[model samples]
Target chain A: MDVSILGTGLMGTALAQALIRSGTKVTVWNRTADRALPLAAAGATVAESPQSAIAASPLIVISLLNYEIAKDVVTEADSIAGKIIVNTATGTPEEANQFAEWIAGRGARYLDGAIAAYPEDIGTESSGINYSGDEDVWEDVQSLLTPIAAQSRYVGARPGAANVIDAAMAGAFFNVALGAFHEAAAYVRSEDVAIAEMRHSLHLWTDKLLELLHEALKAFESGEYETDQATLNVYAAAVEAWQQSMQRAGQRAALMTANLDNLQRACAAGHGDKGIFAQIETLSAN
Target chain B: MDVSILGTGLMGTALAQALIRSGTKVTVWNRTADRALPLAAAGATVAESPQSAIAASPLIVISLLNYEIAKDVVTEADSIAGKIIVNTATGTPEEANQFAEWIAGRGARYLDGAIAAYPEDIGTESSGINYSGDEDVWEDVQSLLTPIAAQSRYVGARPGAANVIDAAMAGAFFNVALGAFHEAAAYVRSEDVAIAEMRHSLHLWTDKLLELLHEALKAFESGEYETDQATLNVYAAAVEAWQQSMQRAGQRAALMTANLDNLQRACAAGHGDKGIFAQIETLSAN
Candidate 1:
């Protein structure tokens, strides 16, 4: 087989199916034997054990539940000395670093990967998986990984880089932003306004935000927050007013309250005259 | 003059300039005479008082610091019985409703407007201003308002609709989301990862978010939280893990913590097997 998948969970099965559809040989194994049956029906080899799965192919793809479970299963694999181990598990940077070191000590090349798409998006063009590890290993497995995700990218040589980027962008930023949107929708709904009515305005604001992010990143890079738009003081007042309005409607405004605290901190540091991006400095003050 | 602009602040001045550039006669006024001088130099007639500004044209545009100040100035106008009063000042839906009623009692046609662009974008095609009030008044003033913002739209007949949309989309959602991004960037920077390195990933997440928002809104509308993607339980676990990771890094994960609470509340309410949108039901409960 070209590649052996160590787990046959939802994401792992999707990965195996994508590879099999691309006319690649795939051997899949799971702790629960029934989970691998569907993939077997879809033209994949069902291995009884992880060791047999690892021994069947030169490349091993681990998609277990988490880093701890992945480590347990991979440790039982026999004779993976010359194998290429690609771990596509959700984990922290420290866990990724330790796992990479463990695999390297076993005489195997390792690549730490973080998948940014859901299971249903696995075989689509929209699916993206970012990997970070030895450059040679990344180049060797680039073609092998493309069938799983068309937008596979090698981020950097640091084994923890993929996890760091995933945690920062997907976990920290996007998830929290989504929660804020829900809270806003709930607040409006409480005020007897239908959530559907805000759809067009939401789209307009999303487009504006995408445009502003590039400018904000530039300011973060250069440490200059001057702008012709609204200043930090203006945003502070607006946020404060909005928070008060939500409070009056008996809606929880925790996120907006936190945002106001951040803005007020920046203003207190004499950044009231600067642009709203000035909050990045105060936020980074730790 | 075709239109009269009151309170020549930055936004007010921009509006008058756009009108003058469009070959429409404009009259401007400000409490501080110096603020109106620039508009006069830009081919606008400077009104000595708010009363004269109101009497100069059938359309009076009020752009002031807040609804309170706008109401104060408009109340002092000599007569506005046959005038179309468009207030672009920032305020809540309640305030807009109250101000609209006050203007109607004065025998003026009231149109509550909410500007969704910065001052620099006022005259551009990308600029958008949503108004909510009498449909007849909107049709009559549509041509006169086009030069100020090419994307102006009459949202609804309810005078507070525009302000409600603004508060929900821009104030509660967009602003809070931006703050979450700053905190996430700060956390990553604290981990010795340069903020610039996450730019590509940030863009990817943003694109994914915009796509997910459509699906989420549909789910919210239908009240069906079933999904082939991640469940609320899955999200709750991931959010909890992320919050712990941030705590380990000495970063404040207030927004994520709030998100986790919302997710857990939905989970506790027996929506754990549903999609993340199930949280909306729990959030809207209060």
Candidate 2:
């Protein structure tokens, strides 16, 4: 259970707490100095510098805000040779690969991680860390990563896989999903539909949608986007109707309009007979 | 159990099938005429024309393609006096209210309905018909509406409330959600992340997001949009990072970009301190 944590931001602090609670000895450090005092009070050793923090254990967990800060701290440490750096910072896939290359060039194993939960959800089962880099190294360090997130999994062998999934899941799905919800609430609010009543409709529609996405994914994997359930053509009508209705209600519907544009482009590409998931093909072309 | 179904399209026929399965004596009609023969075998009376169909029962359930066609069919019936007209047609709220006025002028009780599920979902608990008009009239026709969907509910007393919710839920939420999933799948696919890997991520993210939306609605109803869990300021950075990451990966992030635009606008409007749901205020202003 040897571990050292760098960058004690909210998430890093929570990760230290989880490790300490799980009876694992933890060493923590932060550039601001006081961010780690709370972790120190919770039985963690507050290292004075990043070098000491990296030297303290075989496994070093870095949770900086971005890749630049991550490299800066590691550069200050001067040498990460022979250390396994598990970075939970947010960055582009190319950045993830480049960081892996630089860290590995300095004679260390690099694992890029993307945390798929709020900082408060870290160390909880509901939160997960998607990791990718070296599978063999992952097999060795997987247990150490558990104190940060028990739901951790190695997404693939590529160093950037985790970040790709991060962008796809958090940026594309969660952000857009919440954005749509905000738009809906505003639209419903404008029309004087009680905001409270939307709770049920929101649930029903979300659950039904996720169920359809699962089916869509199944169709996607089989190399076919055909479906009798609801074709892109039928869906186009609904989207058009909704867009018109929203405009009448004074909702800008920016997100839906963009989605409809994508759907219509797919339809124009001779995919109206396929499932709505066929838009993936249209989108990839863009 | 007496009912009349107008416009025997796929949806109208499904509605008729559900009613007949519930042991109602259904009278069916269509302009093309042959679509009703299946219902005739199911013990429905195939009517001669729209007028004959409307004359057959006290409860007239119309599922035409649009308000114009619906208006035309009901106009052909000449006088719908004393009948409870449950219209499940797709149209604008103004159109819904206008149709309600026209039907009410003809001495008929009007209930504008919106079906939130596909035809295959009819007669099942999974589907629901959102009805709006007079609540007292809703109470009386509620039992007769059960065959279409057991989960059916009277959303409000205004004739157009159901259509408003329908647009918000279907167009804004479900349509946008599916669009996001398409973007995610395409992004993941282009980035070399296994397409199948998205299933788990999709589920986890969607469940987490919807849970947040429920919480957001609660805050919205309280006339406050403040939350300590996460603020828009932190969210904006992640969204921007994701947007850049997607672009780097060659994935077209149309929906995410639009969502980011909305988020940034809210942050610019001094809502950076509130929960992301505060964007609802920004949206309503549009």
Candidate 3:
């Protein structure tokens, strides 16, 4: 088999289906036998156990619940020596590091991957998965991984790098933004405003967000947070005003309150005159 | 003069300059006399005081620090009767509502405006300013307002609508996302990762944000939050993991913690199977 997918959960099934559709021979296994049946029907070989699945191919892709469960399942494998074990489980950097070390101790090449797309996004152009650890393993298995996600990228040599990016980009940035939008929408709804009216303005705000992101990245890299526009103090004051508005509307502004706290802290740390990105340094210090 | 701009702060000056550059006769004023000199040099009439500035034209644009200060300045205007007052000061919806009432009580038309661009962005194609209040007044002054912001928009008849949009979109969504990015970047940096590696991924995240924003708007409008993809429970779990990861890295994930709290609250409210947008309803209920 070209690859073995251990775990026929939603994401794992999607990964297997993508590989199978790419004409790559795939072996799939799940703790629950019925889960793997669909992939088997789709031309994947159904392995009785994870060990057999690992034994079926040189590349073993583990997409279980998380690193802990993945470790338990992969530990049952009799021998994974000389095989490349690519774990696409959601985990922290520390977990990824420990798992990588454990896999390496078992004489297997290890690669940590974090998926940035939903299960339905697999194999589509919008699908992305960032990998880390074992540059040689990534280079050798690049073709195998591309079938799952065209945007598969090797982030760094550190075993936990992919998890860092996943946690930071998706966890902290994207997901938090989603929650903030919920709060924003709720606040707007409190005032009897239709959410539809916010569509165009949201797009405009997103444009501003993109511009700020570019400036923030530059500020982060150069460590020069000076700006002629809104300073950290200005942002804090605006947040304070918004928080008051939310309060008046009888809505709890949890995310905005947290954001204001951070901004205030940054300003207190003598970054009031600097751009908002200076919070990166202030936050890192704590 | 065609328009009188009250306050000569960076944004106020930008607004005046955009009008002057558009060949509209402009009168500019600031409490600090020296601040209005630059606009005077830019072919704008310098008003001796706030009252003089208000009297210079039929249209008055107030761009002070906040609604209170704007109120203090505009209150000093001897007679604003029959004129249109467009206030662009950062303020809460309640404040805007009160200010609008105050302006209307003085026998003047009121229009509340919220600027979505930086000082430097003024006069450019990217400049946007959303207004709320009397539609007829907006229609009558559309040409003059276009000189300040080509994308000037009349949002609603309610005077507070513009402020609500500003707080929700810019304050809650955009600014909060910027703060979240700071925390994310800080967390990533804690792991010794370079922020440069995050540029492409950030762009990807922003793309995902755009997609989610569209879905969220639809879900919000329809009041249906069901999803076949990741649910609130899933998001909550991911956020918990990320929070743990930040703790492990000796970083405080403030915004993520707040986000996780909201997700868990929504999940606790039995919307675990629903999408994250369900939080809007959950938050609104409180």
Candidate 4:
């Protein structure tokens, strides 16, 4: 099978290397043209122009920096037909959907892949970042993405799901981890202690806390907060403490405070009998 | 062993019954006097007056509503010299320490307690309530309090440890539990979702979160947040998101803002390098 990888950045290079090692007929292309030289040396066909590379293979995995660059490259027709366009570009879900339409209009089938699978640990179980959009294309790339990651969740035929999940995963991974850090920091700080000791202590607690937090998330997902250990009254008190955690960051814990206030209002709004997590939203302080 | 129980409420009744079951000849008293009748029927000796009750036992376990009542009873001492005053009254650490001084003036050994163990769970392993302060008394009551609850934790020898631990325990318990409720409620209200479904779905996750929360406490006890997920930067991101969670909670999240500000401030005040636990006191909500 022949595979063409566009772009020669860190991720692009990583992909090229992985594919070359997999013994696929690989063609490499980049905007600067010279960056693909290393891959060319390592048994890859280097293309002078983007169109030549896209025409070189049936499966063109386009990994670009952004939507604009990707769109600019693919628009240059040049015998672009029958080939599967797997767009591993950095774009929003909406943009991916739009780009998919643009490609499918011209006789080429497009799969907007916000390639969640990162470069390093490419195909490893530890890296949970593989996602595709179309069923047929997903089937075609199963062998490609599976070794890179364990899961290849097909999010409908819309290219947008790939990018949407991609962007959403970013927020999920970074944000949830961030929130964990904040609560832990606030807790240790409240005790008037040091970070080294706090971190050591926090690591021990994260497992328990993560479980507690998962329950909280379930409460969020279920739209109720009436757990045995958790309640609105309990949460408000906690958020107050967490607010101090954020305040220590020199930014107002506006996000945390407002989240609690919303509950206070809801309980006041006759949901007092209900749990605190009954009012889930993308809670922002503003 | 001779034991005197003051305040014949439900808790007091349970205590009297428990002591009787444990084979201790118990003398019980109450402000109204009549409230002690049921305990007397349950094999406890009803004291006609607190003075008589004082004279009746060598170790007096006084359980009252607040510091005011505890102080009131002590003044009526009828010379409680050389008696071990086991103050089972409910109050603060500060108040307990103060009472230690007050009881010392009466030439009495004061050991504070915070017990309101359940009627059924009494005398069943630390299943009831935990106590703190004065190790020797703990040793004395250890044999006794153990029967009332298998989980009787004698926190420390310091007279104030009981109330302090009480405050801290409540702080820990309520903070996260309340946080769960607060968060769940917001999700329920915002998405127009059902609480029953939310409750069912969120329960397991909520339990898991509690398990994870244990890690935070552990991290603090051992100095190690700086190098791990419990670090300042990580926590900053978390609090910022919690700020989002709080915003979703409406008014309930307001109390949390103060603490969030504290966390953020510490990060900005050049203490970001320090462990989050120790930095808590120094961080101001700017």
DockQ by candidate, in order:
0.50, 0.62, 0.60, 0.09
In candidate 3, stretches whose alpha carbon ends up further than 4 angstroms from where it belongs are A8-10, A13-56, A72-77, A143-150, A227-229, A281-286, B20-27, B30-56, B75-77, B143-150, B284-286
Clashes of 4: 145
Q: State each model's CA lDDT, in order.
A: 0.83, 0.83, 0.85, 0.58
Poorly placed runs, candidate 2 (over 4 Å): A20-23, A38-45, A76-79, A123-125, A146-150, A227-230, A284-286, B7-10, B13-27, B30-34, B38-52, B123-125, B146-150, B227-233, B284-286
Which lDDT value does model 4 have at B62?
83
User: TM-score: which candidate is best?
Assistant: 2
Candidate 4 residue-wise lDDT, B150-193, digit = tens: 45555555676555333333333333334434443443344332
What DockQ results for candidate 4?
A: 0.09
Task: Supply the TM-score for candidate 4.
Answer: 0.55
Interface CA RMSD of each prediction in angstroms: 2.1, 1.7, 1.6, 8.3
Error of 2 at B49 (Å): 4.3
lDDT of 2 by residue, B1-286 (tens): 5989897888989998988888788999998788778888878899989899899999999978788888888888778899989999866788889999998899989989998887888877678788899787788887777667857778888788888888888888878988898888888888878878677666677678778888888878887886666788888888887877777778678998899889888899998988887877777434
- Model 1: how far residue B122 lies from native, Å: 4.0
lDDT of 2 at A192: 84
What is each candidate's fraction of native interface contacts (fnat)? 0.52, 0.76, 0.73, 0.07
* Candidate 4 segments exceeding 4 Å error: A1-286, B32-34, B116-120, B125-133, B172-176, B197-214, B229-231, B238-252, B255-262, B270-286
Error of 2 at B6 (Å): 2.9
Clashing pairs in 2: none
